[PDB]
Amino acid sequence: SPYSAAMAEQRHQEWLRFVDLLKNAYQNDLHLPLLNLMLTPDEREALGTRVRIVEELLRGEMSQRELKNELGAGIATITRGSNSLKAAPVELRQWLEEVLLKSD
Amino acid sequence: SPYSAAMAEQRHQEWLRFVDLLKNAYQNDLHLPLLNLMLTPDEREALGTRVRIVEELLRGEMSQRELKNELGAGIATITRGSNSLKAAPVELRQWLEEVLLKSD
Ligand SMILES: N[C@@H](Cc1c[nH]c2ccccc12)C(=O)O
Ligand SMILES: N[C@@H](Cc1c[nH]c2ccccc12)C(=O)O
Ligand code: NA
Ligand code: NA
C-alpha cells in the first residue's frame, strides 16, 4: 500500500507516548524496570555497544577499521553510527563531547 | 567460548552507561535527538507498538488473538510482552496501570 500521512501521524503519536512514558519513569526511579520490560536482552546489548562506538567516533583516536577489530562491531554498524552522528544537531554533538570525553 | 562473568560485568557497565546518558539527556531536553541518534527507525516503531501492547494487556478488554488482529503484531510478539509483564516488579505494573489506563 502507498505511504499514508495519516498512518505516519499515528506512528508519531505512539513513539512520543514511549518517549513521555520513559521520561516519567526516570522521574519516579522506575526507568530500570521499564527498560527491562520494553527492550529485549539483544537490544540492551546493542545500545551499550552503540554508546562505545559514538564515544570512539567523537574521540577520533581509532580508525573505523581499528574500531571494528577492537569492539567486534561490523563495518556496516559503524557506518550507520558515523552517518547518524554527522546528521545530528550540533548542540547534541557538543553535549556528547562534554559528557563522553574526559577533560583534558 | 564459555560464558564469562568478567564479560558480563563489562556488558552491564556499558548498559548502565546508556541508561545514565539518557537520564542526563532528559534533564537537558536533548532526549529526542539522542534517541534519534541511538535507535533505528524500525526500533522506534517497535517501541511505539510495544507500549500499545502493554496498555491493552493491562486493560484486559481484548483477547491476545484479538490484539494480533487489531494491531498487526504476531502472536510471538504479544507473548513476549505478556511474559515480560508477568515477570515485572509489582510496583512497575501498578504504576503502568496508573499512567496508561484512563481514570474510571
Ligand atoms: N540512528 C541509527 C542507529 C544506529 C545503528 N547502528 C548504530 C551504531 C552507532 C550509533 C547509532 C547506531 C540508524 O538509524 O542507523
Ligand atoms: N522485555 C521483552 C521485550 C519485548 C519484546 N516484545 C515485546 C512486546 C511487548 C512488550 C515488550 C516486548 C523481551 O525480552 O521479550
Ligand atoms: Na577513538
Ligand atoms: Na485490552
Side-chain angles (χ1 to χ4, degrees), chain A residues 1-3 5-6 8-69 71-104, chain B residues 1-3 5-6 8-69 71-104:
Chain A
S1 173
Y3 177 89
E9 286 162 358
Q10 179 170 349
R11 289 180 297 265
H12 187 258
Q13 178 189 230
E14 284 165 10
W15 163 244
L16 277 181
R17 188 164 205 218
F18 168 78
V19 176
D20 290 343
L21 180 72
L22 179 57
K23 181 179 317 169
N24 288 131
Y26 273 107
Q27 292 170 181
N28 288 292
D29 263 11
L30 288 168
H31 43 114
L32 254 314
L34 183 64
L35 291 168
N36 283 155
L37 174 70
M38 303 295 310
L39 291 172
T40 62
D42 290 358
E43 285 159 0
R44 300 193 290 271
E45 191 161 325
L47 289 167
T49 298
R50 293 178 189 163
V51 173
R52 284 283 295 302
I53 296 168
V54 170
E55 179 173 86
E56 295 299 345
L57 289 177
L58 288 171
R59 173 177 292 115
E61 163 58 9
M62 295 183 200
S63 71
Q64 292 193 187
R65 78 184 166 295
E66 170 166 20
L67 248 198
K68 160 184 178 270
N69 287 308
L71 321 186
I75 294 301
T77 292
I78 294 156
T79 299
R80 291 187 83 161
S82 181
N83 288 164
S84 302
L85 191 63
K86 286 180 194 197
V90 162
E91 56 272 39
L92 174 74
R93 198 156 321 116
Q94 293 169 175
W95 182 74
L96 286 176
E97 294 175 336
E98 302 173 345
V99 309
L100 294 181
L101 304 185
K102 308 282 202 139
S103 177
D104 36 56
Chain B
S1 173
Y3 177 89
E9 286 162 358
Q10 179 170 349
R11 289 180 297 265
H12 187 258
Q13 178 189 230
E14 284 165 10
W15 163 244
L16 277 181
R17 188 164 205 218
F18 168 78
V19 176
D20 290 343
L21 180 72
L22 179 57
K23 181 179 317 169
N24 288 131
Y26 273 107
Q27 292 170 181
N28 288 292
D29 263 11
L30 288 168
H31 43 114
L32 254 314
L34 183 64
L35 291 168
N36 283 155
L37 174 70
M38 303 295 310
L39 291 172
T40 62
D42 290 358
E43 285 159 0
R44 300 193 290 271
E45 191 161 325
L47 289 167
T49 298
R50 293 178 189 163
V51 173
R52 284 283 295 302
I53 296 168
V54 170
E55 179 173 86
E56 295 299 345
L57 289 177
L58 288 171
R59 173 177 292 115
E61 163 58 9
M62 295 183 200
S63 71
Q64 292 193 187
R65 78 184 166 295
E66 170 166 20
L67 248 198
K68 160 184 178 270
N69 287 308
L71 321 186
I75 294 301
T77 292
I78 294 156
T79 299
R80 291 187 83 161
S82 181
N83 288 164
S84 302
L85 191 63
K86 286 180 194 197
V90 162
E91 56 272 39
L92 174 74
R93 198 156 321 116
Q94 293 169 175
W95 182 74
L96 286 176
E97 294 175 336
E98 302 173 345
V99 309
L100 294 181
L101 304 185
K102 308 282 202 139
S103 177
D104 36 56

